[PDB]
Amino acid sequence: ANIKSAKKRAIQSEKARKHNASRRSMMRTFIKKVYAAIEAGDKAAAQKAFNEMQPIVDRQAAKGLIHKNKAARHKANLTAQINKLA
Amino acid sequence: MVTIRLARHGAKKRPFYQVVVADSRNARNGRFIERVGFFNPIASEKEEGTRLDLDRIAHWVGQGATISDRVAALIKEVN
Amino acid sequence: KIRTLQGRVVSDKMEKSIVVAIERFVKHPIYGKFIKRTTKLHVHDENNECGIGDVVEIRECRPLSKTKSWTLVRVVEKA
Amino acid sequence: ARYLGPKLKLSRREGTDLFLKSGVRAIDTKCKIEQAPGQHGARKPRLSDYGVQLREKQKVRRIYGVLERQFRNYYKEAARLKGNTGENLLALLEGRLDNVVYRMGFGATRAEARQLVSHKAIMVNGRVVNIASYQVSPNDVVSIREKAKKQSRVKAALELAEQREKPTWLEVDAGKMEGTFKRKPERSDLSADINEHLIVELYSK
RNA sequence: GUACACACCGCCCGUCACACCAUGGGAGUGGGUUGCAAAAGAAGUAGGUAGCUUAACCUUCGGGAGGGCGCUUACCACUUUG
RNA sequence: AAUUGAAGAGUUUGAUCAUGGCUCAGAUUGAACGCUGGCGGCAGGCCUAACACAUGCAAGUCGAACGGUAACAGGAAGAAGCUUGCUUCUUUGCUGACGAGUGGCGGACGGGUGAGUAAUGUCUGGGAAACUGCCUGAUGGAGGGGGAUAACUACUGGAAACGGUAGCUAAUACCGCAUAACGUCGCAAGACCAAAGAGGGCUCUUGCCAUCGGAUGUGCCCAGAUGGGAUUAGCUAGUAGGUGGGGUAACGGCUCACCUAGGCGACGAUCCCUAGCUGGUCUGAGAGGAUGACCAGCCACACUGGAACUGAGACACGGUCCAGACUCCUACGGGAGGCAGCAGUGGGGAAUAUUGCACAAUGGGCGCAAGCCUGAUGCAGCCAUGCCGCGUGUAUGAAGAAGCCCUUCGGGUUGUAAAGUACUUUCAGCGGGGAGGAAGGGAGUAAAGUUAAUACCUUUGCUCAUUGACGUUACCCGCAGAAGAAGCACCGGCUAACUCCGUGCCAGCAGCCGCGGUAAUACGGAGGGUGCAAGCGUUAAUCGGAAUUACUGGGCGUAAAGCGCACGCAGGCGGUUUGUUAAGUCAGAUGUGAAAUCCCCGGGCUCAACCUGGGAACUGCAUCUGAUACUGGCAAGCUUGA
Ligand SMILES: [K+]
Ligand SMILES: [K+]
Ligand SMILES: [K+]
Ligand SMILES: [K+]
Ligand SMILES: [K+]
Ligand SMILES: [K+]
Ligand SMILES: [K+]
Ligand SMILES: [K+]
Ligand SMILES: [K+]
Ligand SMILES: [K+]
Ligand SMILES: [K+]
Ligand SMILES: [K+]
Ligand SMILES: [Mg+2]
Ligand SMILES: [Mg+2]
Ligand SMILES: [Mg+2]
Ligand SMILES: [Mg+2]
Ligand SMILES: [Mg+2]
Ligand SMILES: [Mg+2]
Ligand SMILES: [Mg+2]
Ligand SMILES: [Mg+2]
Ligand SMILES: [Mg+2]
Ligand SMILES: [Mg+2]
Ligand SMILES: [Mg+2]
Ligand SMILES: [Mg+2]
Ligand SMILES: [Mg+2]
Ligand SMILES: [Mg+2]
Ligand SMILES: [Mg+2]
Ligand SMILES: [Mg+2]
Ligand SMILES: [Mg+2]
Ligand SMILES: [Mg+2]
Ligand SMILES: [Mg+2]
Ligand SMILES: [Mg+2]
Ligand SMILES: [Mg+2]
Ligand SMILES: [Mg+2]
Ligand SMILES: [Mg+2]
Ligand SMILES: [Mg+2]
Ligand SMILES: [Mg+2]
Secondary structure (H helix, E strand, O other): OOOHHHHHHHHHHHHHHHHHHHHHHHHHHHHHHHHHHHHHOOHHHHHHHHHHHHHHHHHHHHHOOOOHHHHHHHHHHHHHHHHHHO | OEEEEEEEEEEOOEEEEEEEEEEOOOOOOOOOOEEEEEEOOOOOOOOOOEEEOHHHHHHHHHOOOEEOHHHHHHHHHHO | OOOEEEEEEEEOOOOOEEEEEEEEEEEOOOOOOEEEEEEEEEEEOOOOOOOOOOEEEEEEOOOOOOOEEEEEEEEEEOO | OOOOOOHHHHHHHHOOOOOOOOOOOOHHHHOOOOOOOOOOOOOOOOOOHHHHHHHHHHHHHHHHOOOHHHHHHHHHHHHHOOOOHHHHHHHHHHHEHHHHHHHHOOOOOHHHHHHHHHOOOEEEOOEEOOOOOOEOOOOEEEEEOOOHHHOHHHHHHHHHHHHOOOOOOEEEEOOOOEEEEOOOOOOOOOOOOOOHHHHHHHHOO
16 A cells, blocks of 8 residues: 555454454354254244344444344344244 | 535636535536526626525525535625 | 336236236337337236236336336236 | 738729728829739639629628638628628628727728727727727717827828718717717618628628 | 441450459468357355364353354356367 | 528530539538748647556545654753853653554545446436435433553564564443333334543533434436347347245345246347447538537446455545566565556657646635645646637828839839838837735634633624735836738639740649640749638548438439239228227426526627626426327227228
8 A cells, every 4th residue: 555544544444354254253153043943943942042143133233233124134034934933 | 415615617817606506525516416606706896796595505504505615705795 | 196007918928927018109200100119018917817918007116026127907908 | 810911902803992092082093993903904804603702702801801700700690690691791890990980080091990999099988999890889989099189190080081971870079089889880871882692692602 | 227426447345465453262371259068266255164272241260152263165266178 | 589591513425405423612620741920818738559657746634532752842840061040951741732653534535547338338207125424403312341452662583575472551442231212123012222532611512322304425126218230030047937045225036945937039139340328519401410529417447357345335546355467676585566646758649738836716635723635626838729809010102113024015014012201009028007816714802692600612793913826917007119020822614813934745733624745824933813811721530512311302114223923921001970088199287308508688808709697498208187180999880992
């Protein structure tokens, strides 16, 4: 980078990348647990996983890691599938 | 944001300004939303140097449009 | 009202989808003769009611597929 | 940007006096007006329709001392202006400050009037105008500068103007050396010798 | 009647020969572009997890959760072959 | 008021009329070249190599987020040569500030280019399933904690670029927890989600979080329109549709699994070639034709190919990663770079400018502000590249002078032309005056508002200094003197303008027809003339003339042209009456049709070019409301066509 602000921006974007990826990975891990429980066919396990996931997706949306619509989609999709599992 | 500012037209050494409402990002003489008046800095005596549509300007200020320093001074001198 | 088009069904082979031919009478730009022009639209038919040769009314809607942004309103005439 | 050559040759080619001299003496005494200029001038060749049209346009240009580009622009303006194009064209040429100064009698010739205008001796509505092509509106007042009032040429020109027929559309006061352009001259006011239709046709060629 | 008009001692056709010019074919030859069938797999992103490692949370204080790195798979640019 | 609009000619023949091609007169240009060249105003200026690029500059800013203190500029304190009261020398972020660093915001704008793209583009008109920093309206919140880390310090690896290890530290950096509803998920019950402080003197200002609005920007969908080629006719398996899952801000084959076999195409699919699109521009009486430089809108691209990350926004010109070709540095291990920003260089080319000045104005980023940054922009330089204006004198002047050219030697012509005489001084030159572009901002000053407060802050008047790159400004005035200022093409016909001499089918000219072989208005020179004029010619290029692709507006017995004949699908077209419909059509209204441009009426630069106010126009598209003759649809007929 030729310009000073660009050099600083590259450092900050890399720091942001690492921070975001960690949170993004964690959120996906919790979402995967819900889907695994649905695949297992245990509604109670699915609901427990869902309850752990819900605060994470909501908070990450608030942090701006994801959009609120995406958080809403995850909750809506999972709720429907868990209800079908019943 | 939306702003009211002077687009510089006219000829060299004889500036004539159109008062326009524009997205601030756009070039000075580029895309604008609406023309609300004009300012002629070198207007002759017996000729109207400044004309402004205050109702349209007020409407835009109500919608959150900012005003450039020069346009604000022009509004003051008009009223 | 709601903007609608009326056309003849030309294909009903697709499941829940029909191809409708809309005829427009247009004056030729140079020659000035009024010429029939055809526009074919893929239309959604939920109940697979329509059949080839039927006259139907269709309305524009959100995209339902790659080629479908129109839905059946009514079957005006059966084949 | 001005013709600086011999004046009488132009009149000889046209075959009519273009008033390119003061008129203190007859043109016939000064030159052989009848004969065209040059070695073969005595011979009178037959003139084509194009030739007739060209000669009429050149005559009008030579009278007012306008070059082709400016004259073409006058034609275009006259055609754009409402009414008779040919009449409009003559009106534009008459409206020139140069012509008005000569017609008011401040200048002996249009060329003399030109020098007066160019040399900032002329005021229009109390402002100095040094542009020969400047168009004088009705009710405009054209006056010599106070400094230039003392010039001998201007006094001589006024005397010559008395000998000439007085323009109806111009009101001029001698001694005061001011004049008013009352109205744009009518076609009737101008000479019937000029055939403006030939010029209009020529520019449609 | 005529395709003649310094007017039938008119006009005018084609092969052949010579020169020159554009162009078709031509064993093929060399480039450009491109189809198809495959090969390939940098970086990145996503999925998975031999191993390694870990500030913030939890903890019975051992650890756990989660994360990172590494590895692996998918996609794909270069490139390669017919 | 927005109009006013339309020319032909030459050339086939012994001659004619017709047909028909070719050629010319016009207008225009980002032009180039040749000859020539005074000034000014305004505008324009790599059309080729999207070739390669030396050097400088084109993006920062904020100390009112933070730890700080590398500077410097003080202060204080303490020591000092001891100005004996300053000076010197230290210490102290102590302060004005402020390097480097963290953090915020900007860097997605502004600027360039037209390579790609024949549609994931553009234009016009509709539309639904969206998001949207800064700005703005409303209603609330803003509690209480934690773990880090850069800078820094020590050490350490590299030639360099760039690092590594350990220790320490802050925040409006980061993460829990509490709070949780006009928010999200849910049929509901329920469940779940945030925040940040800082500054001025308890108060004020500003910032932070949530939700809902507005505004702006952006994504997406549909219809019509938008080059050429059929000696390209078939094309397509995520293909076309469905179901479900995933994905997106959002609808969607967007993706995937499964199911069905579709979908597109002679109303030209597919393939090939070419091309950024538009407002407009040039031409034209118009209808058309041609074009898309400058200016403005949209799109695309940023060494080439590819990829994501950060972010409200990018798959990012002066960011990141990878690969490649190039250039470069190297200690040979490894590094670095991207002017289609501005200026400039080399190269290519018929051809296209200065490595300028200033942020004074307008506008943009950051900032409470002051201000800082801004090759945007304003200006200046260069160039007759164009447009426009102006000058290069002007009256008098027969001697009709010389000299030239022609001549029947009488003369004629150059030519009032020149001299001579009398005047004028624009512009150029020299000198002296002198606007406007400046708004604001900064100090004070008063009042009001605010508040515990005549504080601070804000607002509004008031007062005082002050801000112009252009710039030796525009403009004005004075001075001296005709002084300092004319060329280019053409003269056989078309086509305005004629002779002499030289040359003798040569040398040469030439747009066409043609000219030149000894009396050439056609070559070359001269005299004279014609047309233009600071230009004039030539070449290239577009439209015109060309009614010569003919919609307006042509033809086909013999000039080019009726298929050898016929049947017939698609298509085009169709007798007469009534009713109905209202699609075409017609009328009105509404929305839209960016601004600029063009046109009309005005205004401003001494005029003009140029600039500018308002209108008209934008012939279109959509919708709504009407009319119903004609055409179409539908229904019922009728008899004349069949
Ligand atoms: K910064
Ligand atoms: K050959
Ligand atoms: K002809
Ligand atoms: K392009
Ligand atoms: K697809
Ligand atoms: K689907
Ligand atoms: K066009
Ligand atoms: K590219
Ligand atoms: K941002
Ligand atoms: K500035
Ligand atoms: K026709
Ligand atoms: K009818
Ligand atoms: Mg001129
Ligand atoms: Mg060959
Ligand atoms: Mg790989
Ligand atoms: Mg600093
Ligand atoms: Mg924060
Ligand atoms: Mg909470
Ligand atoms: Mg191209
Ligand atoms: Mg025509
Ligand atoms: Mg993001
Ligand atoms: Mg950038
Ligand atoms: Mg660059
Ligand atoms: Mg450059
Ligand atoms: Mg060269
Ligand atoms: Mg700088
Ligand atoms: Mg002639
Ligand atoms: Mg001879
Ligand atoms: Mg031409
Ligand atoms: Mg034509
Ligand atoms: Mg014909
Ligand atoms: Mg024959
Ligand atoms: Mg024939
Ligand atoms: Mg026949
Ligand atoms: Mg209708
Ligand atoms: Mg417009
Ligand atoms: Mg009927």
